[PDB]
Design a protein around this motif. Structure first.
Motif, mmCIF file in Angstrom:
data_model
loop_
_atom_site.group_PDB
_atom_site.id
_atom_site.type_symbol
_atom_site.label_atom_id
_atom_site.label_comp_id
_atom_site.label_asym_id
_atom_site.label_seq_id
_atom_site.Cartn_x
_atom_site.Cartn_y
_atom_site.Cartn_z
ATOM 1 N N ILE A 56 15.103 -23.665 18.612
ATOM 2 C CA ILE A 56 14.341 -23.225 17.462
ATOM 3 C C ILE A 56 14.255 -21.622 17.334
ATOM 4 C CG2 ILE A 56 13.051 -25.210 17.511
ATOM 5 C CD1 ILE A 56 10.670 -23.658 18.466
ATOM 6 N N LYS A 57 14.373 -21.206 18.561
ATOM 7 C CA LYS A 57 14.368 -19.429 18.523
ATOM 8 C C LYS A 57 15.683 -18.943 19.115
ATOM 9 C CE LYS A 57 9.271 -20.072 19.061
ATOM 10 N NZ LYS A 57 7.992 -19.469 19.456
ATOM 11 N N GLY A 68 5.372 -17.617 14.745
ATOM 12 C CA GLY A 68 6.749 -17.963 14.208
ATOM 13 C C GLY A 68 6.662 -18.138 12.735
ATOM 14 N N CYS A 69 5.565 -18.568 12.148
ATOM 15 C CA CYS A 69 5.788 -18.656 10.657
ATOM 16 C C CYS A 69 5.646 -17.139 9.941
ATOM 17 C CB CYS A 69 3.955 -19.328 10.076
ATOM 18 S SG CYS A 69 4.068 -21.107 10.586
ATOM 19 N N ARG A 72 9.712 -16.188 9.801
ATOM 20 C CA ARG A 72 10.108 -17.133 8.559
ATOM 21 C C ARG A 72 9.993 -16.351 7.530
ATOM 22 N NH1 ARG A 72 13.946 -18.221 6.056
ATOM 23 N NH2 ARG A 72 13.468 -19.776 4.307
ATOM 24 N N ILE A 110 7.430 -19.003 -1.763
ATOM 25 C CA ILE A 110 7.524 -19.460 -0.284
ATOM 26 C C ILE A 110 6.875 -20.859 -0.157
ATOM 27 C CG2 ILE A 110 6.656 -19.136 1.859
ATOM 28 C CD1 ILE A 110 7.042 -16.261 1.657
ATOM 29 N N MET A 118 9.981 -30.252 3.728
ATOM 30 C CA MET A 118 8.856 -30.989 4.157
ATOM 31 C C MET A 118 8.718 -32.530 3.780
ATOM 32 S SD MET A 118 5.294 -28.469 3.887
ATOM 33 C CE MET A 118 4.990 -27.460 5.403
ATOM 34 N N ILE A 125 12.109 -26.615 10.696
ATOM 35 C CA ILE A 125 12.251 -25.190 10.921
ATOM 36 C C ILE A 125 13.624 -24.956 11.598
ATOM 37 C CG2 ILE A 125 9.892 -25.324 11.304
ATOM 38 C CD1 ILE A 125 10.576 -25.451 14.323
ATOM 39 N N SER A 126 14.047 -23.610 11.793
ATOM 40 C CA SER A 126 15.057 -22.992 12.247
ATOM 41 C C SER A 126 16.464 -23.584 11.602
ATOM 42 C CB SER A 126 15.228 -23.593 13.681
ATOM 43 O OG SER A 126 14.025 -23.192 14.350
ATOM 44 N N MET A 132 8.938 -30.030 13.240
ATOM 45 C CA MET A 132 7.786 -29.841 13.855
ATOM 46 C C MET A 132 6.740 -30.816 12.935
ATOM 47 S SD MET A 132 5.785 -26.264 15.158
ATOM 48 C CE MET A 132 7.133 -25.744 16.051
ATOM 49 N N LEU A 137 0.754 -29.419 13.936
ATOM 50 C CA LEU A 137 0.416 -28.276 13.256
ATOM 51 C C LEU A 137 -1.159 -28.633 12.859
ATOM 52 C CD1 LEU A 137 3.502 -27.584 10.940
ATOM 53 C CD2 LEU A 137 2.771 -26.585 13.001
ATOM 54 N N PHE A 147 -4.917 -23.797 8.240
ATOM 55 C CA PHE A 147 -3.765 -22.710 7.690
ATOM 56 C C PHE A 147 -2.614 -23.314 7.298
ATOM 57 C CE2 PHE A 147 -0.085 -19.879 8.687
ATOM 58 C CZ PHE A 147 -0.429 -18.782 7.434
ATOM 59 N N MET A 148 -2.062 -24.384 8.161
ATOM 60 C CA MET A 148 -0.932 -25.076 8.019
ATOM 61 C C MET A 148 -1.131 -26.272 7.111
ATOM 62 S SD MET A 148 0.787 -23.403 10.276
ATOM 63 C CE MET A 148 0.434 -22.251 11.484
ATOM 64 N N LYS A 151 -0.097 -26.298 3.085
ATOM 65 C CA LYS A 151 1.043 -26.331 2.552
ATOM 66 C C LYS A 151 1.658 -27.597 2.472
ATOM 67 C CE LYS A 151 0.342 -21.926 3.825
ATOM 68 N NZ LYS A 151 -1.109 -21.432 4.105
ATOM 69 N N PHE A 152 1.345 -28.495 3.506
ATOM 70 C CA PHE A 152 1.599 -29.956 3.256
ATOM 71 C C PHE A 152 1.082 -30.667 2.258
ATOM 72 C CE2 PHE A 152 2.608 -29.311 7.729
ATOM 73 C CZ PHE A 152 4.234 -29.773 8.109
HETATM 74 C C1 LIG Z 1 7.438 -19.736 5.645
HETATM 75 C C2 LIG Z 1 6.775 -19.737 6.820
HETATM 76 C C3 LIG Z 1 5.638 -20.542 6.877
HETATM 77 C C4 LIG Z 1 4.508 -20.396 6.281
HETATM 78 C C5 LIG Z 1 3.429 -21.530 6.418
HETATM 79 F F1 LIG Z 1 2.429 -20.948 5.974
HETATM 80 C C6 LIG Z 1 3.733 -22.677 6.878
HETATM 81 C C7 LIG Z 1 2.872 -23.687 6.821
HETATM 82 C C8 LIG Z 1 3.084 -25.087 7.272
HETATM 83 C C9 LIG Z 1 4.354 -25.222 8.016
HETATM 84 C C10 LIG Z 1 5.452 -24.178 8.102
HETATM 85 C C11 LIG Z 1 5.176 -23.098 7.503
HETATM 86 C C12 LIG Z 1 6.061 -21.922 7.611
HETATM 87 C C13 LIG Z 1 7.528 -22.339 8.043
HETATM 88 N N1 LIG Z 1 7.469 -22.097 9.479
HETATM 89 C C14 LIG Z 1 8.564 -22.013 10.190
HETATM 90 O O1 LIG Z 1 9.794 -22.043 9.590
HETATM 91 C C15 LIG Z 1 8.196 -22.040 11.605
HETATM 92 C C16 LIG Z 1 7.604 -22.735 12.384
HETATM 93 O O2 LIG Z 1 6.564 -23.765 11.356
HETATM 94 C C17 LIG Z 1 5.213 -23.575 11.924
HETATM 95 C C18 LIG Z 1 7.148 -22.718 13.674
HETATM 96 C C19 LIG Z 1 8.099 -22.220 14.378
HETATM 97 O O3 LIG Z 1 7.900 -21.994 15.615
HETATM 98 C C20 LIG Z 1 8.992 -21.316 13.642
HETATM 99 C C21 LIG Z 1 9.064 -21.263 12.482
HETATM 100 O O4 LIG Z 1 10.058 -20.361 12.158
HETATM 101 C C22 LIG Z 1 10.438 -19.687 13.099
HETATM 102 C C23 LIG Z 1 11.446 -18.449 13.134
HETATM 103 C C24 LIG Z 1 11.272 -17.467 14.321
HETATM 104 O O5 LIG Z 1 11.555 -16.246 14.457
HETATM 105 C C25 LIG Z 1 10.392 -17.934 15.569
HETATM 106 C C26 LIG Z 1 10.219 -17.260 16.736
HETATM 107 C C27 LIG Z 1 11.354 -16.438 17.114
HETATM 108 O O6 LIG Z 1 9.081 -17.319 17.459
HETATM 109 C C28 LIG Z 1 9.522 -19.224 15.221
HETATM 110 O O7 LIG Z 1 8.749 -19.525 16.085
HETATM 111 C C29 LIG Z 1 10.167 -20.479 14.208
HETATM 112 C C30 LIG Z 1 11.394 -21.167 15.037
#
Ligand SMILES: CCc1cc(F)c2ccccc2c1CNC(=O)c1c(OC)cc(O)c2c1OC1=CC(O)=C(C(C)=O)C(=O)[C@]12C
Lengths: 261, 11
Positions: A56-57, A68-69, A72, A110, A118, A125-126, A132, A137, A147-148, A151-152
């Motif tokens: 994922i990373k 991570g969020c 992204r 976003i 979802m 993700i990724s 996930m 979450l 906080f998560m 969104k769902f």
């Molecule tokens: C647009 C960002 C956003 C905002 C929100 F408010 C969200 C609420 C609920 C679910 C996803 C949400 C997201 C989307 N989240 C992800 O895409 C998302 C995620 O998800 C946990 C968990 C997660 O572990 C990662 C996510 O995307 C990532 C890019 C990185 O550079 C990471 C590095 C290098 O550490 C990460 O950690 C990743 C792989």
């Protein structure tokens, strides 16, 4: 002319495909398991998260996930910015107004696009290389879990509308070109662009969803709901970097949130 | 908003 409105919708769709790597079509092809390429790595707990790090990373966990969020979202802001610049008339607007439209519009977009990745059980993700679970979450310690979840909550309702990428391209354009954002200098040119995009959206919905006459009206209300949804997001976020010593916020995100009354 | 500014002008 309706012909020109369809040409516009197609232009927006093509630009959308160029700006956003993972489309809803591709996302759902993975979510439903209709693809042949490696399915995503499923993360449903602390242990699985550890194992999938390389897939994922390219509380340290709740913060780790929050980080991570943030990354992204930063990437998403840039993708949306590229899309906005493809909307006819946008780059010719006063530059400060362009900044204002993005400042108040990015998070609403976003949330909208997040829904595409979802389902009731989780989020992709990724670029679809990972999945996930929602429950994992949601279980994150306070106040990250709450906080998560929202969104769902939004995604479930929004996805019930069954919009496709073609619908979304116009919907997103309409939101970005909102002439009532705080601090805009030249409202009329923005309102004129939106009026035309709205006509394009109406025709798109009438042709693409012939059996759902209420769709256009519902999307207009969704645009209003997104503002309320974003305010709640901004608040819950300003309480995290307010109640979490070990919480750094990406510069770009700080800029967007700063003075976002 | 110089960062948003920069993204809007590049590419
Ligand atoms: C647009 C960002 C956003 C905002 C929100 F408010 C969200 C609420 C609920 C679910 C996803 C949400 C997201 C989307 N989240 C992800 O895409 C998302 C995620 O998800 C946990 C968990 C997660 O572990 C990662 C996510 O995307 C990532 C890019 C990185 O550079 C990471 C590095 C290098 O550490 C990460 O950690 C990743 C792989």
């Amino acid at each position: 002319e309706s012909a020109d409105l369809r040409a516009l919708a197609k232009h927006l769709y093509d630009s959308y495909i160029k700006s956003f790597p993972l489309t809803k079509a591709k996302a759902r092809a993975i979510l439903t398991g209709k693809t042949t390429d490696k399915s995503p790595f499923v993360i449903y707990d602390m242990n699985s998260l550890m194992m999938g790090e390389d897939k994922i990373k390219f509380k340290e966990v709740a913060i780790r996930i929050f980080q991570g969020c943030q990354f992204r979202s930063v990437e998403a802001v840039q993708e949306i910015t590229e899309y906005a610049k493809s909307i006819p008339g946008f780059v010719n607007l006063d530059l400060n107004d362009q900044v204002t439209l993005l400042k108040y519009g990015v998070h609403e977009i976003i949330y909208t696009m997040l829904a595409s990745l979802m389902n009731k059980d989780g989020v992709l993700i990724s670029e679809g290389q990972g999945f996930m679970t929602r429950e994992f979450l949601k279980s994150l310690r306070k106040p990250f879990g709450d906080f998560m979840e929202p969104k769902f909550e939004f995604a479930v309702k929004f996805n019930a509308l069954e919009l496709d990428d073609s619908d979304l391209a116009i919907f997103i354009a309409v939101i970005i070109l909102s002439g009532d954002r705080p601090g805009l200098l030249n409202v009329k040119p923005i309102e004129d662009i939106q009026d035309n995009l709205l006509q394009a959206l109406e025709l798109q919905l009438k042709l693409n969803h012939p059996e759902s006459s209420q769709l256009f009206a519902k999307l207009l209300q969704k645009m209003t709901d997104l503002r309320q949804i974003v305010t709640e997001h901004v608040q819950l976020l300003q309480v995290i970097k307010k109640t979490e010593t070990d919480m750094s916020l990406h510069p770009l995100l700080q800029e967007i949130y700063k003075d976002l009354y | 908003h110089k960062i948003l500014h920069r993204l809007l002008q590049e590419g």
